[PDB]
Structure 1
Amino acid sequence: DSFVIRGDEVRQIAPGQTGNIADYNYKLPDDFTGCVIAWNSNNLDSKVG
């Protein structure tokens, strides 16, 4: 599963989490078996203006 998110909200991408993204955008199971992999992408995913 793949998406772009602000660095502060990456903490919400885990089992049992709460807040805007975990609540309203991407919800993991309580019993998640898996990996959550992330990197800062500022050189590609930011733009002038």
Structure 2
Amino acid sequence: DEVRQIAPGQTGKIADYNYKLPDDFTGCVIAWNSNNLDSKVGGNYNYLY
């Protein structure tokens, strides 16, 4: 869901506490699902925010 907060000019808890982009961002964003790589049935709590 946060993959939308990533884009420039956005706002939110992710955009206001941990990771924030600039308004004039020039670059490229790439994203792919890694559920099978980094997800477990018991809960892969290694990822925090």
> Would you say same fold, with TM above 0.5?
yes
CA offset digits 1:4-32 (Å, max 9, x no partner):
xxxx1110001100112111111101100
Q: Name the TM-score, length of structure 1 as normaliser.
A: 0.74
Whole-angstrom CA distance in 1 between matches of 2:2 and 2:16: 11
Displacement of 1:36 after TM fit? 1.0
Mark the runs of 5 or more structure 2 residues left unpaired by the alignment: 42-49
Mark the runs of 5 or more structure 1 residues left unpaired by the alignment: 1-7
* Structure 1 residue ranges (4+ consecutive) displaced by more than 2 angstroms after TM superposition: none
Whole-angstrom CA distance in 2 between matches of 1:23 and 1:31: 17
Aligned length: 41
In percent, how many aligned pairs have the same letter? 98
**Pairing 1:19–2:12 present:** yes
Which of 15, 27, 34 aligns to 1:34? It is: 27
Q: Name the TM-score, length of structure 2 as normaliser.
A: 0.74
Asked which structure has the greater CA Rg, the reply is 2
What is the Cα-based RMSD across aligned positions, in Å? 0.9
